[PDB]
Design a protein around this ligand. Structure first.
Ligand code: UJ1
Length: 304
């Protein structure tokens, strides 16, 4: 019983974090097989950050201008390529701790665990969602760049996120592990705007299911509704509209609790149009959208 924001155990990622140093810029990198992946802005000085020419900047650097360190081990860089916004350094040594891993680009509304690091050392682990506007509400200080987001599927580590920067608004932007930004952001110290953020409706519904399961049923009502009718109310409140795929994904939670998705949608509507009124759900006074239906099931079934 009980319900928490749970992160994946970080063990397998801890063994891939390294410190990367070019000139006087240091940040984190990710050491898999005989390659170190890190944000390409490692090769910028402070002057350069307003309007960097990454091609002209990279042409000045050699293999020996890069210092990769794993704990007290120095690694020797023997190749270097730029792939979009990441830098690949080819090292002499394959990482004995390299896990079963994939690189995955994720979709907005998906959750993952971040291992936040400084100088290639772990400081803490937390779970978060990729916002619909392609930012994350993270916790990152200077030097956290190259911290990664990851999911685990049994013994397989799926890398989905590398942290590149904080926006002037205080939220976080980064790339997949092929160096493509999530969202419309560039790795440039200039003013950039995220879109309007929305609430991830499917995840709110999954959290309501988690609540019922764990005893918390006050908000259940007699009413029901249409998908169309429900989406009209969701839009006025900046909620993501609900598709049939979203209904299909909640089927298991529906079956386990014996509550129709649309009956749960009717319960949600009523909370949008009346708020919580000084009540709580799983000890939150707000609607929580950082658990997917997958997360609720893993946590409420005991998946290792
Ligand atoms: C790892 C580097 C680092 O800590 N930061 C960073 C990113 C960059 C760019 C992408 C511009 C080359 N330069 N330095 C900072 C960061 O992004 N700083 C920042 C902030 C906090 C607010 C507005 C603009 C900028 C950069 C112009 C960083 C990254 C994550 C978390 N805290 C700070």
């Amino acid at each position: 019983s009980g319900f928490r924001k749970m992160a994946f155990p970080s063990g397998k990622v801890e063994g891939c974090m390294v410190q990367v140093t070019c000139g006087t810029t240091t940040l984190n990198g990710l050491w898999l097989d005989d390659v170190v992946y890190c944000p390409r802005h490692v090769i910028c000085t402070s002057e350069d950050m307003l309007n960097p020419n990454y091609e002209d900047l990279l042409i000045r650097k050699s293999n020996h201008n890069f210092l990769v360190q794993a704990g007290n081990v120095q690694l020797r860089v023997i190749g270097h390529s730029m792939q979009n916004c990441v830098l690949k350094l080819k090292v002499d040594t394959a990482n004995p701790k390299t896990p079963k891993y994939k690189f995955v680009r994720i979709q907005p509304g998906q959750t993952f665990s971040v291992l936040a690091c400084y100088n290639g050392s772990p400081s803490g682990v937390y779970q978060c969602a990729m916002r619909p506007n392609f930012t994350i509400k993270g916790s990152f200080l200077n030097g956290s760049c190259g911290s990664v987001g990851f999911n685990i599927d049994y013994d397989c580590v799926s890398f989905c996120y590398m942290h590149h920067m904080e926006l002037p608004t205080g939220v976080h932007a980064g790339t997949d592990l092929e160096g493509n930004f999530y969202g419309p952001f560039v790795d440039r110290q200039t003013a950039q705007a995220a879109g309007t953020d929305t609430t991830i409706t499917v995840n709110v519904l999954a959290w309501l299911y988690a609540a019922v399961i764990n005893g918390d049923r006050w908000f259940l009502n007699r009413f029901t509704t249409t998908l169309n009718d429900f989406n009209l109310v969701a839009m006025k409140y900046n909620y993501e509209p609900l598709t049939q795929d979203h209904v299909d994904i909640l089927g298991p939670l529906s079956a386990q609790t014996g509550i129709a998705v649309l009956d749960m949608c009717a319960s949600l509507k009523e909370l949008l149009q009346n708020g919580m009124n000084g009540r709580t759900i799983l000890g939150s006074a707000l609607l929580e959208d950082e658990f997917t239906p997958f997360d609720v099931v893993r946590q409420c079934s005991g998946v290792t």
